[PDB]
Design a protein around this ligand. Structure first.
Ligand code: NA
Length: 209
Protein backbone atom coordinates (compact mmCIF):
# COMPACT_ATOMS: atom_id res chain seq x y z
CA UNK A 1 0.00 0.00 0.00
CA UNK A 2 1.22 3.51 -0.77
CA UNK A 3 1.28 6.76 1.17
CA UNK A 4 -1.18 8.45 -1.19
CA UNK A 5 -3.75 5.75 -0.46
CA UNK A 6 -3.47 6.54 3.26
CA UNK A 7 -3.78 10.27 2.67
CA UNK A 8 -6.83 9.77 0.45
CA UNK A 9 -8.59 7.64 3.04
CA UNK A 10 -7.82 10.18 5.73
CA UNK A 11 -9.21 12.93 3.53
CA UNK A 12 -12.44 10.96 3.15
CA UNK A 13 -13.00 10.86 6.92
CA UNK A 14 -11.62 14.30 7.64
CA UNK A 15 -14.84 16.30 7.55
CA UNK A 16 -16.75 13.93 9.78
CA UNK A 17 -13.91 13.40 12.23
CA UNK A 18 -12.91 17.04 12.54
CA UNK A 19 -15.51 18.12 15.10
CA UNK A 20 -14.58 15.21 17.34
CA UNK A 21 -10.86 15.89 16.96
CA UNK A 22 -11.31 19.60 17.67
CA UNK A 23 -13.53 19.02 20.69
CA UNK A 24 -11.10 16.48 22.11
CA UNK A 25 -8.18 18.85 21.60
CA UNK A 26 -10.05 21.62 23.40
CA UNK A 27 -10.18 19.28 26.39
CA UNK A 28 -6.44 18.62 26.10
CA UNK A 29 -5.70 22.35 25.90
CA UNK A 30 -7.92 22.96 28.94
CA UNK A 31 -5.90 20.45 30.97
CA UNK A 32 -2.58 22.08 30.06
CA UNK A 33 -3.88 25.64 30.56
CA UNK A 34 -6.07 25.30 33.66
CA UNK A 35 -5.05 21.97 35.15
CA UNK A 36 -3.64 21.63 38.65
CA UNK A 37 -0.66 19.46 39.50
CA UNK A 38 -3.08 16.76 40.60
CA UNK A 39 -5.12 17.04 37.41
CA UNK A 40 -1.94 16.59 35.38
CA UNK A 41 -0.89 13.68 37.61
CA UNK A 42 -4.14 11.88 36.89
CA UNK A 43 -3.49 12.25 33.16
CA UNK A 44 0.05 10.95 33.62
CA UNK A 45 -1.53 7.97 35.44
CA UNK A 46 -3.93 7.41 32.54
CA UNK A 47 -0.89 7.13 30.31
CA UNK A 48 0.77 4.63 32.66
CA UNK A 49 -2.38 2.48 32.51
CA UNK A 50 -2.86 2.56 28.76
CA UNK A 51 0.72 1.56 27.84
CA UNK A 52 -0.53 -1.82 26.66
CA UNK A 53 -4.27 -1.35 27.18
CA UNK A 54 -7.17 0.35 25.49
CA UNK A 55 -8.13 3.99 25.84
CA UNK A 56 -11.52 2.71 26.91
CA UNK A 57 -10.01 0.88 29.86
CA UNK A 58 -7.93 3.84 30.91
CA UNK A 59 -10.89 6.20 30.69
CA UNK A 60 -12.91 3.84 32.89
CA UNK A 61 -10.04 3.58 35.40
CA UNK A 62 -9.67 7.35 35.52
CA UNK A 63 -13.42 7.78 36.09
CA UNK A 64 -13.54 5.18 38.89
CA UNK A 65 -10.33 6.06 40.73
CA UNK A 66 -10.03 9.81 40.15
CA UNK A 67 -7.83 11.50 42.74
CA UNK A 68 -7.13 8.06 44.20
CA UNK A 69 -4.09 8.08 41.91
CA UNK A 70 -2.72 10.82 44.16
CA UNK A 71 -3.59 9.60 47.63
CA UNK A 72 -4.35 5.86 47.79
CA UNK A 73 -1.83 3.48 49.33
CA UNK A 74 -0.27 0.96 46.98
CA UNK A 75 -2.43 -2.01 48.01
CA UNK A 76 -5.72 -0.13 47.71
CA UNK A 77 -4.74 1.38 44.36
CA UNK A 78 -3.78 -2.05 43.03
CA UNK A 79 -7.13 -3.41 44.19
CA UNK A 80 -9.05 -0.66 42.36
CA UNK A 81 -7.01 -1.29 39.21
CA UNK A 82 -7.79 -5.00 39.49
CA UNK A 83 -11.50 -4.16 39.88
CA UNK A 84 -11.59 -2.05 36.67
CA UNK A 85 -9.94 -4.86 34.75
CA UNK A 86 -6.30 -3.91 34.36
CA UNK A 87 -4.17 -6.96 33.56
CA UNK A 88 -1.13 -5.73 35.53
CA UNK A 89 -2.62 -3.96 38.52
CA UNK A 90 0.21 -4.45 41.02
CA UNK A 91 2.96 -3.18 38.77
CA UNK A 92 0.96 -0.23 37.39
CA UNK A 93 -0.03 0.74 40.94
CA UNK A 94 3.65 0.68 41.90
CA UNK A 95 4.57 2.93 38.98
CA UNK A 96 1.86 5.45 39.88
CA UNK A 97 2.80 5.55 43.57
CA UNK A 98 6.48 6.06 42.66
CA UNK A 99 5.57 8.85 40.25
CA UNK A 100 4.06 10.90 43.06
CA UNK A 101 7.58 12.29 43.42
CA UNK A 102 6.70 14.38 40.34
CA UNK A 103 3.83 16.28 41.97
CA UNK A 104 4.96 19.90 41.98
CA UNK A 105 6.93 19.54 38.73
CA UNK A 106 4.23 18.75 36.14
CA UNK A 107 2.88 22.25 35.38
CA UNK A 108 6.36 23.41 34.45
CA UNK A 109 6.99 20.25 32.37
CA UNK A 110 3.81 20.69 30.39
CA UNK A 111 4.74 24.30 29.58
CA UNK A 112 8.37 23.56 28.78
CA UNK A 113 10.03 22.58 25.52
CA UNK A 114 8.11 19.43 24.70
CA UNK A 115 11.14 17.54 23.41
CA UNK A 116 13.00 18.23 26.64
CA UNK A 117 9.94 17.44 28.77
CA UNK A 118 9.52 14.12 26.99
CA UNK A 119 13.19 13.24 27.67
CA UNK A 120 12.61 14.01 31.34
CA UNK A 121 9.56 11.79 31.61
CA UNK A 122 11.23 8.91 29.80
CA UNK A 123 14.10 8.99 32.26
CA UNK A 124 12.21 9.83 35.45
CA UNK A 125 8.59 8.68 35.29
CA UNK A 126 7.94 4.99 35.97
CA UNK A 127 5.86 3.14 33.42
CA UNK A 128 6.42 5.96 30.94
CA UNK A 129 8.59 5.42 27.86
CA UNK A 130 8.91 7.40 24.64
CA UNK A 131 5.38 6.60 23.46
CA UNK A 132 3.66 7.21 26.77
CA UNK A 133 5.54 10.46 27.43
CA UNK A 134 4.46 11.71 24.01
CA UNK A 135 0.93 10.63 24.83
CA UNK A 136 0.87 12.49 28.15
CA UNK A 137 2.21 15.69 26.62
CA UNK A 138 -0.24 15.56 23.71
CA UNK A 139 -3.10 15.02 26.17
CA UNK A 140 -2.16 18.33 27.86
CA UNK A 141 -2.37 20.18 24.53
CA UNK A 142 1.08 19.66 22.99
CA UNK A 143 0.88 19.33 19.20
CA UNK A 144 4.53 18.79 18.26
CA UNK A 145 4.86 15.08 19.13
CA UNK A 146 3.80 11.76 17.62
CA UNK A 147 2.47 8.86 19.66
CA UNK A 148 4.05 5.82 18.05
CA UNK A 149 1.91 3.02 19.38
CA UNK A 150 1.35 -0.34 17.76
CA UNK A 151 -1.64 0.86 15.68
CA UNK A 152 0.24 3.81 14.26
CA UNK A 153 3.40 1.76 13.60
CA UNK A 154 1.41 -0.90 11.77
CA UNK A 155 -0.17 1.81 9.59
CA UNK A 156 3.26 3.21 8.81
CA UNK A 157 4.61 -0.22 7.89
CA UNK A 158 1.58 -1.13 5.76
CA UNK A 159 2.03 2.06 3.74
CA UNK A 160 5.76 1.70 3.28
CA UNK A 161 6.83 4.51 5.62
CA UNK A 162 8.92 2.17 7.74
CA UNK A 163 10.29 -1.27 6.97
CA UNK A 164 9.92 -2.89 10.38
CA UNK A 165 7.93 -2.28 13.56
CA UNK A 166 10.24 -1.45 16.49
CA UNK A 167 9.52 -3.49 19.60
CA UNK A 168 11.61 -1.11 21.70
CA UNK A 169 12.82 2.49 21.51
CA UNK A 170 15.78 4.84 21.86
CA UNK A 171 15.83 8.63 21.59
CA UNK A 172 17.36 8.56 18.13
CA UNK A 173 15.02 5.87 16.76
CA UNK A 174 11.83 7.37 18.16
CA UNK A 175 12.81 10.82 16.85
CA UNK A 176 13.55 9.29 13.45
CA UNK A 177 10.22 7.49 13.03
CA UNK A 178 8.41 10.48 14.53
CA UNK A 179 9.96 12.77 11.90
CA UNK A 180 8.77 10.43 9.12
CA UNK A 181 5.22 10.70 10.47
CA UNK A 182 5.59 14.46 10.93
CA UNK A 183 6.15 14.86 7.22
CA UNK A 184 2.96 12.87 6.57
CA UNK A 185 1.03 15.04 9.03
CA UNK A 186 2.39 18.13 7.29
CA UNK A 187 1.29 16.76 3.89
CA UNK A 188 -2.21 16.38 5.34
CA UNK A 189 -2.12 19.86 6.92
CA UNK A 190 -2.33 18.88 10.61
CA UNK A 191 -0.02 18.98 13.59
CA UNK A 192 1.32 15.60 14.77
CA UNK A 193 -0.83 15.77 17.91
CA UNK A 194 -4.11 16.19 16.01
CA UNK A 195 -3.01 13.97 13.13
CA UNK A 196 -2.78 11.10 15.63
CA UNK A 197 -6.52 11.44 16.31
CA UNK A 198 -7.37 11.34 12.62
CA UNK A 199 -5.23 8.17 12.31
CA UNK A 200 -7.12 6.54 15.16
CA UNK A 201 -10.50 7.47 13.68
CA UNK A 202 -9.72 5.06 10.85
CA UNK A 203 -10.13 1.99 13.07
CA UNK A 204 -13.67 2.20 14.42
CA UNK A 205 -14.66 5.82 13.87
CA UNK A 206 -13.93 6.89 17.43
CA UNK A 207 -11.97 9.71 18.96
CA UNK A 208 -10.92 8.80 22.45
CA UNK A 209 -7.68 9.98 23.97
NA1 NA B 1 10.27 6.40 32.30
Amino acid sequence: HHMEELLKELERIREEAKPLVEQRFEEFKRLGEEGTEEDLFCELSFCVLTANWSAEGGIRAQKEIGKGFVHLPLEELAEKLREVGHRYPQKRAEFIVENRKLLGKLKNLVKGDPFQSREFLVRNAKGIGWKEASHFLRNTGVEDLAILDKHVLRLMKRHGLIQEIPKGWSKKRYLYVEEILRKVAEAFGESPGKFDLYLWYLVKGKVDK
